Design a protein around this ligand. Sequence first.
Ligand code: 2DK
Ligand code: 2DK
Lengths: 274, 287
Amino acid sequence: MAIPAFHPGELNVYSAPGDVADVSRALRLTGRRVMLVPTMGALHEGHLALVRAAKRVPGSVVVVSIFVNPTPDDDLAQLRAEGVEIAFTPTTAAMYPDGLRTTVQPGPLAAELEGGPRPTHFAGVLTVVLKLLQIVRPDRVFFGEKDYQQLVLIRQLVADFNLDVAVVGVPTVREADGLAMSSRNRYLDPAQRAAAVALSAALTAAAHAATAGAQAALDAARAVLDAAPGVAVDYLELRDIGLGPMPLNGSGRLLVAARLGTTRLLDNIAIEIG
Amino acid sequence: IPAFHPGELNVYSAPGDVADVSRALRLTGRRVMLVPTMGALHEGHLALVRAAKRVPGSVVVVSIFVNPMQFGAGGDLDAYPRTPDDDLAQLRAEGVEIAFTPTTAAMYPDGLRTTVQPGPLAAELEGGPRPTHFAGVLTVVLKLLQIVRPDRVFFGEKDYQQLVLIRQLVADFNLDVAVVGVPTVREADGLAMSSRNRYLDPAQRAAAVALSAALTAAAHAATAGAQAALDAARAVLDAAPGVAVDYLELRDIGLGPMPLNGSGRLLVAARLGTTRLLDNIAIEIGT
Ligand SMILES: COc1ccc2c(c1)cc(C(=O)NS(=O)(=O)N1CCOCC1)n2CC(=O)O
Ligand SMILES: COc1ccc2c(c1)cc(C(=O)NS(=O)(=O)N1CCOCC1)n2CC(=O)O
């Protein structure tokens, strides 16, 4: 049948999975490399940084998905401002025309860490990321490193189901005092917002303490969080980069999550032991 | 790209070799057709192959891989028939160009980790007593679909619940493949092909015609309604020596949560000694 209209150099918006699927396939056949940036709308500078990373690939056409897995005007304007040529904005019914039926079951990592208060969260994530990658068939898909467990789970999905996409993690964009960017940050009151910096300050102190070994890094991060009031830490864990157990020597990742009033914040950093 | 010699049987074990050859063929215009099998090939598998070969410009990839994740445990994996030499002889005789024969380590280098969780249909019928069976099937078929990226994938209708769940997988994860169901090839008396048929002794093989005779009596009985269709099938199964019926169920064609209307599928599973046989048929009610 006829390819949907696509106007190069402007923001083309599709809601129908089949429409974006046909346009992506037509573009790829024309010598473009399809880049997917999955979002849930409400775009912030962290999403812009995903887009800029995608746009850097020569020959790129950038597809930004906006889907809340169960404001439009402003998101699309930001996308236009960034030179993004494709926005995919499906309804829940278009993504799930048969309801919830076959789904993705993550490996046991999805039960750990975030998987504690939210046991089925990552099955949902992995299911819609899978569907997005099958609809759009991108050459590369971009995610921020803030939701680091999510990123690892995505790389396990890609390995395990033999998907033909490159997973690109982009360093977390941070506020000027280091607080990782988040939709949730606007909910903090001024005391909570001041206390919230302890997450990024604990992890950066740990990254530097790590020359003295893993225990020093963990104790430094704990002392920073202990200097903050009304920061209820859920976990502070050193793991290897794939979120297995931290090797005695080598590269790793330090992850923290805490509740400030009603707001849950997460951060993580690269750690190099000794 | 490893070597590909056209009009010869090319056998690849490494998922990256078949992926590269397939993508290269697709980019030169050939449509890639996948026939996934667990080996022990019979005439029903060759009908799948012939269906695939009829697609103009096709290149046919037949996968052979006894998938450990769909077997419970209780010796079933070890006992599955393996007939590698006859399988490859048959594919050469049919003109198949690509056989894909992955090792268990190439398919599951990290063990069982991310997997497909089917919808509720997987817990019905064959999956009632085997709750993780269809998760194993749909996980492997997804990986095979990803590695080979066929235009069309071909399955027999004999394992009809499996087929319906594979269409579910395809729709639910937006896979860009067409699923082609091919009608069950049958012995001359009607017995559905199966590479479990080898475990029927001569008495069991005689008795096993009752599954097909029961289904085809039911299809004709159906002018008189669902009860007459089921009771004709039941009568034939009951007259048969040493057939133990697991289930006999008439459902809507999608086997989903909707009542039977005009078009139905009648499914049977029965044990002859230790051998469990499946069959099914299209049923039109009245009309
Ligand atoms: C490259 O730097 C970053 C930094 C933070 C990021 C991102 C990237 C991406 C996200 C993010 O959560 N994206 S989202 O689309 O899953 N969704 C945004 C709207 O609120 C819920 C999170 N976030 C966190 C967030 O927005 O809550
Ligand atoms: C077109 O005619 C036919 C007839 C029967 C077929 C086929 C083709 C294909 C198969 C087959 O693929 N069976 S299976 O690998 O998916 N599997 C065998 C183990 O029992 C569960 C289904 N089988 C089923 C079988 O061999 O039992």
